Amino acid sequence: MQNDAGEFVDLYVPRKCSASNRIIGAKDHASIQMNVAEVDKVTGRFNGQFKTYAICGAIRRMGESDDSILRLAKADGIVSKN
């Protein structure tokens, strides 16, 4: 990442999976970046703000992308507690 000079010496910082915290590879074509919308507290309309989740190929193939999205949505307060 950083040499003793100070400057960052790298092509690009890769995205880590929101679920498993593994590096999403360059040619990870089964990897997903899903945007979930934010509602206005009163009216319940798409204000413009959104919250992004990234899932790697492994978690998609396993079939645990569903529970991973759900539990992230629960944690971030998109899905109601219980």
Binding site: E64, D67, S68, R71
Partner: protein, 82 residues
Amino acid sequence: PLAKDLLHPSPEEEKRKHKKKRLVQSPNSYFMDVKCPGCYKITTVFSHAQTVVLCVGCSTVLCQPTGGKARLTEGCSFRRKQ
């Protein structure tokens, strides 16, 4: 899969799972008191018992040795202790 609290499993799942493969070990057996129809004296018996037990009060068989839990004689009422 992927999110279970190994720390706090639900008590119905705890009871279903094998006595030795529980999170903390506890026996499925229990101690119960027997009230014989032709006697006043009370006796305590093990739920899975191995010996034909006798009530010296009236000199009558109480429970029978079986593959699992000991079958009590007809009339003798069993009640759970603590």
